[PDB]
Amino acid sequence: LAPSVVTGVAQSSPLTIVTNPKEPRQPVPASDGADYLKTIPGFAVIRNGGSNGDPVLRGMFGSRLNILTNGGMMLGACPNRHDAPTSYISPETYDKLTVIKGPQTVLWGPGASAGTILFEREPERFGELGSRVNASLLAGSNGRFDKVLDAAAGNRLGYLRFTGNHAQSDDYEDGAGNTVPSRWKKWNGDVAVGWTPDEDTLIELTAGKGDGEARYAGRGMDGSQFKRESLGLRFVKSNVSDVLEKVEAQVYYNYADHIMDNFRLRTPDPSSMMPMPMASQVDRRTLGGRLAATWRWDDFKLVTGVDAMRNEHRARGSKYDMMTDYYTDADQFPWSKDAVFHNYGAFGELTWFAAERDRLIGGLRLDRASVKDYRQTLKMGHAMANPTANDTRADTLPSGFVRYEHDLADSPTTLYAGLGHAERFPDYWELFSPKRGPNGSVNAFDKIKPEKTTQLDFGLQYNGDKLQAWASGYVGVVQDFILFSYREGMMGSSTQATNVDARIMGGELGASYQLTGNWKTDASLAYAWGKNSSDDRALPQIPPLEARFGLTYEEGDWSAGSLWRVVAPQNRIARDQGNVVGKDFDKSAGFGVFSLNGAYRVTRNVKLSAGVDNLFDKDYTEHLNKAGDAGFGFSANETVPEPGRTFWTKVDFSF
Ligand SMILES: [Cu+2]
């Protein structure tokens, strides 16, 4: 019953991790989605600044990760992924965070080859008139102040819910004494209205908005605006018939309106190729929906349904009169539409409960994806017609998987093995951001092929008395892996997208052990590996081997913890290759980082927790972090350092 700080999350069932994002986390997150994944083994984060990192799963980047919020897809608008999908998520305002590793589900949309990440809120459960309140406050080094409110009220027939947050921090320092360009500020407000006419029926309306800003040590521009607008309608109908367990219907609308520039959170770099003030505004409008039936009978469960999605991207930019020194801000010009995506899919998942110790799960999905290029012109020179203006392209993509789970006779042990095949239609960033496409093509839009992934997942759960253990491995091949290559060319830096063939393997494992009634210990390991077979060399942007060691003492109302994080050097690199955000250049040094936490239950409604992160003020950087920008003093290919010693205190309220 004793409160504690979360430093790692175990895998609680085959391929699946479930955690409550409201619990304090001990390397302390910057109020974004990527940081709350740092505690799940297998995740690493490309750091841009103090917040809004870009999540990598088993070395896989971007849309290979399927990231949903309440069942819906929120997509960013920045062509450089300043505003990756997790940058809009404040996890403390959600109730549950679920990760499913590998291409092992078809229920949640197309293309999820690396895994599926689901932030969800539970519907209120009032049976009579009442209210509940959850809230938290966090105070830390470098002006870190966070504020969270989750209030609801209702009765048997319906409810109203408000969740909200305001979070901010000044620039932090690395372990060498340097101020890193990294301040950020986030806020969210979301309302939910629930109608429960009877216990077999729920209809929920949601709407919310947020905004933010972030300074980016690792970019030429900062994010001065991360506007989000969200609308959602959900309908869940239970026990419809004796076999129809559940019908689910859902629509959602998500809008992102992002501004980056070189003059609101920094000064233009005189020595750079942007000495004049310069702003770029972009937006993304996403409309999608889902309809799913769940059937149960005999020893079988069948989930069947369809989904659909449309999204639209537009941009406009500022102007600088070199003669007048007159600046015309981006909002003075009309939006120019540049891209529209569509997807429609049908999916089905069948489970056979053979006997009591054996489960077979099989899933299939057929997707129809299309995209239209609306760029009339391309942006060295301002000229350039666009060769594929108003062109469309489409494909039809089947995906599926089979998984066997066997429960042992003489132990609390589950073994599993799965084969998955996933096909992903290319990203906005894979089609529109590359300066060049494959050789001989007119552009990336016209030629880049869908990515096709075939992977074996396997592993085991041990749910013992004093020992809790789990392991999960994977071997896989990727046909037409979409890879970025970087060139200088005096123009600046310029990117080419190509398709290559890849081999991947890796795994995660971890154990929890109750030493005594007060002492517990846990460890985890994560490894990922990648080879570019077409070019006979290593895949880029693969995080090195990582281990975590934790030790906790609990005693009635309080606990104390310590944590060692140890990561090996990454000597497997592919220089000047990567994705749309980052590229490899050097082998990384290994490092160790040490942290302490504690927690105290003051009462049943208020608990306190506190941590020191990186106690020894280690100066270090991660393999995947962005190179620092020359305008901030960084040498060439020197990557953004991680924070030095950091103190924080948190008070959680539950009424
Ligand atoms: Cu941007």
Residue numbers in the entry: 66 to 444, 448 to 723
Report text from the authors:
As indicated by the successful structure solution, OprC contains a single bound copper and shows the typical fold of a TBDT, with a large 22-stranded β-barrel occluded by an N-terminal approximately 15 kDa plug domain that, like in other TBDTs, completely occludes the lumen of the barrel. The CxxxM-HxM configuration, which coordinates the copper in a tetrahedral manner, is highly unusual and has, to our knowledge, not been observed before in copper homeostasis proteins.
Interestingly, the active site His117 in azurin renders the copper atom solvent inaccessible, reminiscent to the likely role of Met147 in OprC. The superficial similarity of the OprC binding site to that of (pseudo)azurin prompted us to generate the M147H and M325H OprC mutants in an attempt to convert OprC into a unique, blue copper transport protein. However, in the presence of added Cu(II), both mutants remain colourless, and comparison of the crystal structures with those of pseudoazurin and plastocyanin show small but most likely important differences in the geometries of the active sites.
